[PDB]
Amino acid sequence: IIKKELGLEKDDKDAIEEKFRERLKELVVPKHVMDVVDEELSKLGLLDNHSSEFNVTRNYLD
Amino acid sequence: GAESHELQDVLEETNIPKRLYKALSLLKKEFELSKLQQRLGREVEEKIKQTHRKYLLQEQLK
Amino acid sequence: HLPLIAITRNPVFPRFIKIIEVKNKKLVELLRRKVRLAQPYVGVFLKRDDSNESDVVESLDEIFHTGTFAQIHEMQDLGDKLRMIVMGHRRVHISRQLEMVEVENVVHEDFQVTEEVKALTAEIVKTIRDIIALNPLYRESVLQMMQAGQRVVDNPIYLSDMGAALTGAESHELQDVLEETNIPKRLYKALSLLKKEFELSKLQQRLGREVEEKIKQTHRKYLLQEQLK
Amino acid sequence: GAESHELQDVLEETNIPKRLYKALSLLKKEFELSKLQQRLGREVEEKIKQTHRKYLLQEQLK
Numbered sequence: 001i002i003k004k005e006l007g008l009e010k011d012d013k014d015a016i017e018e019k020f021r022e023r024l025k026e027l028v029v030p031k032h033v034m035d036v037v038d039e040e041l042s043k044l045g046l047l048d049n050h051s052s053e054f055n056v057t058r059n060y061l062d
Numbered sequence: 063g064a065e066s067h068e069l070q071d072v073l074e075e076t077n078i079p080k081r082l083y084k085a086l087s088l089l090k091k092e093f094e095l096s097k098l099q100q101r102l103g104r105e106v107e108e109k110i111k112q113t114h115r116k117y118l119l120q121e122q123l124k
Numbered sequence: 125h126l127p128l129i130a131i132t133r134n135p136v137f138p139r140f141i142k143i144i145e146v147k148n149k150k151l152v153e154l155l156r157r158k159v160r161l162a163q164p165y166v167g168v169f170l171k172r173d174d175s176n177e178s179d180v181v182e183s184l185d186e187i188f189h190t191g192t193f194a195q196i197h198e199m200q201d202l203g204d205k206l207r208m209i210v211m212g213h214r215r216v217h218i219s220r221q222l223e224m225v226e227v228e229n230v231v232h233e234d235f236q237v238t239e240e241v242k243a244l245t246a247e248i249v250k251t252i253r254d255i256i257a258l259n260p261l262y263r264e265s266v267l268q269m270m271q272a273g274q275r276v277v278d279n280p281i282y283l284s285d286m287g288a289a290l291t292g293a294e295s296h297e298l299q300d301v302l303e304e305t306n307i308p309k310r311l312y313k314a315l316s317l318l319k320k321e322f323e324l325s326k327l328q329q330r331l332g333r334e335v336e337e338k339i340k341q342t343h344r345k346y347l348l349q350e351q352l353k
Numbered sequence: 354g355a356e357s358h359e360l361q362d363v364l365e366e367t368n369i370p371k372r373l374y375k376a377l378s379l380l381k382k383e384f385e386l387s388k389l390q391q392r393l394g395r396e397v398e399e400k401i402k403q404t405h406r407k408y409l410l411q412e413q414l415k
Contacts (some may be wrong), residue, residue, distance in 0.1 A: 002122045002123065003332060005118070005122055005331075006122065006123070007114075007117055063243075063246075065239070066223075095243065099247055103247065103319070106315060106316055106319060107319040108313070109316075110316050110323070111320050111323065116190075117162065118324070118327060122279070347394070347397060347398070347401075350397050
């Protein structure tokens with residue numbers, strides 16, 4: 001909570017979700033891949049950061 | 063919060079309307095004084111609050 | 125004509141009981157030397173910013189010029205070999221500590237209209253009450269024993285010094301209150317400190333209650349998922 | 354919380370004691386329903402805290 005009052009979090013307005021969405025925003029991309037990316041992002045949001053599943057999902061998305 | 067002198071002054075009057083009027087005037091004067099003190103305190107607390115919230119965050123860190 | 129006492133982060137507020145326990149034992153010999161005096165005494169002071177034990181002995185300018193002469197009450201040394209009870213009796217401001225000469229110049233300038241001034245004093249205690257009502261620091265028994273309405277406030281300056289002492293402000297803030305000479309100025313500075321600590325504590329308690337509410341809401345969300353269960 | 358049909362039956366009754374007794378019976382039935390509603394959640398709480406206590410004794414021994 002002190003971090004919320006003043007902390008590293010909530011700075012640079014950077015999120016993995018948004019970062020990956022903007023990375024592909026400049027790419028002429030098909031749709032099937034688009035739905036796969038949507039599913040991967042949904043799982044990543046569902047998946048907790050500390051989980052190894054989360055790291056595997058992040059690597060695959062990268 | 064009126065002083066004892068004002069209480070004696072109110073007790074001095076014989077007619078009920080005059081003593082009631084004096085008591086109402088005393089109440090209004092005391093309310094005005096309390097409002098003035100409250101406004102001055104609000105001024106002081108806002109001036110202190112003019113201190114940037116950074117100090118609050120530093121104290122949270124401490 | 126005594127050497128400066130190593131304060132060692134022991135700010136002795138005026139008229140307020142305090143205990144000093146310095147690691148250095150030299151103060152023990154200093155105290156023992158003044159035992160034979162029929163009028164034992166000790167002068168408390170306040171250290172400046174960037175406290176340094178070596179600078180105190182090597183330089184006498186680190187300690188502020190303002191000081192508080194007090195009378196030794198008792199020597200205990202229950203836990204440590206150095207434990208002195210210090211209070212505030214005689215406030216003084218040395219013209220030049222390096223050059224001791226001391227003048228008990230206690231400025232207590234007051235207006236002859238002693239009718240509306242006490243109102244502000246009332247406000248002071250009110251805030252103090254609020255503080256001890258919301259941030260209990262010391263027993264209220266002192267409040268009951270010392271009541272303004274009893275006319276026992278013979279020296280309201282000492283009472284204001286109490287009110288500032290209970291404040292959590294830094295030593296620098298109390299120093300800056302002391303340097304102020306006009307009574308209204310020091311009173312307003314102390315009241316500003318009171319409002320400052322009030323805001324600090326209010327933010328702290330608001331945050332704590334909000335966090336507890338968030339935790340109970342998290343538990344109730346666990347229950348609402350137990351509704352899926 | 355009785356249904357509209359129950360209120361219609363109550364209104365149909367013309368004798369005062371009949372309607373009073375019917376209203377009392379409907380009140381107690383509806384309160385039994387609500388008590389079951391709230392007791393099921395209170396049983397959720399009871400089971401959760403019983404499990405927590407069992408695992409707390411397990412934590413002590415562990």
